[PDB]
């Protein structure tokens, strides 16, 4: 672990916890999230992101908790990283648009939702993005 | 790297939150980074761009400079990841997608590269960038 702290590497890189156990921890983090146990979900998603900062779903989980907690800028920061780590997935850009509206930045929000509609292949996501655009003055 | 610093900062105030370095000094450091870069001092330029990306990671100009350095150094995955951050932050052109396409071709991912270059041709209003993208598509 110390070596990974000094070399900047992840705990996942050194197989510090077996993979099936990490799956279980992610499932439990999601259970806490779905049950509204936000404090515990936050601990578990922070734990996961320490373990593997390059895991898009771990990042997205922590970003979602920050958004629920109305830490909108912190959520938007993580969503930008999640977009870069993902597989052509514009869901983090969609949630960034929601964060920008809550930050009273509607032109930034519009740009996010427009990006989703122009580049995403996720039809359900684009429908949602369009509904936000429909509402944005 | 820069991305791990961004994530650690979010997991765990930061220097940016306290305005620890004023905008005019950051502008100067950015200029100094390109001076090193332009002279072939790419290791020093990398340090300066890493410094900028520690202070203000969500700045497209800092991210694009560092991504270019990684691409020149043939750290293609790191470059691609940073280019994508610049796009998500709203970089006002498709050059991050174009250069990601180049990175993906060097990573032996020609289908990912094709999607990048097709996105450029479909959406860029830069006619010269579109010809460059089309030339890659012709070869893939
Ligand atoms: N297939 C293109 C991919 O979604 C993508 C790669 C890089 C980028 F800057 C934006 C988008
Ligand atoms: Cl915040
Ligand atoms: Cl929200
Ligand atoms: Cl705005
Ligand atoms: Cl462009
Ligand atoms: Mg920050």
DSSP annotation string for chain B: -HHHHHHHHHH---TGGGT-S-HHHHHHHHHHHHHHHHTT-HHHHHHHHHHHHHH-TT-HHHHHHHHHHHHHTT-HHHHHHHHHHHHHTT-SSSHHHHHHHHHHHHTT-HHHHHHHHHHHHHH---HHHHHHHHHHHHH-
Alpha-carbon distance of B113 to B122, in angstroms, equals 14
Per-residue buried b or exposed e for A21-36, using 16+ beta carbons within 10 Å of the residue's own CB: ebeebbeebeebbeee
Between the alpha carbon of residue A92 and those of residues A5, A11, A116, A129, the distances in Å are 28, 24, 9, 12
Q: Which residues, other chains included, contact A21 with Cβ-Cβ below 8 Å and sequence gap of 6+? A: none
Whether B72 contacts chain A with CB within 8 A: no
- Residue B51 in tokens: 């410094």
Technique employed here was X-ray
- Resolution for this experimental structure (Å): 1.6
DSSP state at residue A8:
T
Q: Are A43 and A35 in contact (CB under 8 A)?
A: no
> Which residues surround ligand 1 with Cβ inside 6 Å?
A 88; B 83-84, 87, 96-97, 100, 115-116, 119
CA nearest A87: which of B84, B55, B58, B94?
B84
Distance CA B7, CA A102 (A): 22
Instruction: Report the C-alpha gap between B54 and B47 in whole angstroms.
Output: 10
Give A-chain residues touching B89 at CB under 8 angstroms: 80
Distances (CA, A) of A118 to A17, A42, A113, A114: 40, 33, 9, 6
Please, where are the H alpha helices in chain A?
A: 2-7, 19-34, 38-51, 56-68, 72-85, 91-102, 106-119, 123-135
Q: Which two tokens stand for residue B96?
A: 């991050």
Per-window interface: B 95-124 vs A, CB < 8 A = 115, 119, 123
Q: Cβ of B115 and A78 within 8 Å?
A: no
Instruction: Report yes or no: A62 and A68 within 8 Å, Cβ to Cβ.
Output: no
Cα–Cα dist A71/A99, whole Å: 9
If you measure from the C-alpha of residue B109 to the centroid of ligand 1, how many angstroms do you get, rounded to a whole number? 13
Measured in whole angstroms, how far is the alpha carbon of residue A15 from the centre of its chain? 23
Distance from C-alpha of B133 to C-alpha of B73, rounded to nearest angstrom: 22
Angle of helix A91-102 relative to helix A56-68, nearest 10 degrees? 20
Helix (H) or strand (E) holding A81: helix A72-85
**What is the C-alpha R_g of chain A?**
16
Q: CA separation (Å) from A31 to A24, A45, A61, B57?
A: 10, 11, 12, 32
Q: What angle do CA B123, B68, B111 make, to 5 degrees?
A: 50
d(CA A76, CA A64): 10
A84 is written with which tokens? 């870069």
Collapsed DSSP state (helix, strand, coil) of residue A87: coil
Cα separation, B33 vs A39, in Å, equals: 42
> Rounded to whole angstroms, how far apart are CA atoms A66 and B75?
32
How many whole angstroms separate alpha carbon B59 and alpha carbon B52?
Answer: 9
Q: Which ligand is nearest to the CA of A104?
A: 4
CA distance B1 to chain A (A): 7
In chain B, what's the furthest Cα-to-Cα distance? 50
Nearest in space to B50 (alpha carbons), one of B62, B60, B61: B62
| Separation CA A61–CA A74 (nearest Å) | 13
Largest CA distance in chain A: 52
């Amino acid at each position: 672990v110390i070596d990974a702290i000094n070399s900047g590497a992840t705990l996942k890189d050194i197989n510090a916890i077996p993979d099936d156990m990490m799956d279980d921890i992610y499932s439990y983090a999601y259970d806490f999230y779905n049950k509204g146990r936000i404090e515990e979900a936050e601990v578990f998603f922070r734990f996961l992101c320490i373990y593997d900062f390059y895991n898009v779903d771990y990042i997205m989980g922590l970003a979602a908790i920050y958004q629920i907690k109305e830490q909108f800028q912190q959520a938007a920061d993580l969503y930008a990283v999640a977009f870069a780590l993902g597989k052509n997935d514009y869901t983090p850009v969609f949630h960034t648009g929601q964060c920008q509206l809550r930050l009273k930045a509607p032109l930034k929000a519009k740009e996010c939702f427009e990006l989703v509609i122009q580049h995403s292949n996720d039809e359900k996501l684009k429908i949602k993005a369009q509904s936000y655009l429909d509402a944005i003055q």
